[PDB]
């Protein structure tokens, strides 16, 4: 798990969650589905 990639929110209902000292990017839309690392 390698964190360097840009999860911030990409739309307006997208969501980040915090977790062990990583973060992750769920959303409605399938294609903002991310996970930071
Ligand atoms: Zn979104």
Do not use: F, L
Request: charged letters at 40%; aromatic letters at 2%.
């Amino acid at each position: 798990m390698k964190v360097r990639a840009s999860v911030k929110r990409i739309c307006d209902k997208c969501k980040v969650i915090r977790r062990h000292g990583r973060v992750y990017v769920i959303c409605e839309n399938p294609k903002h589905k991310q996970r930071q690392g």
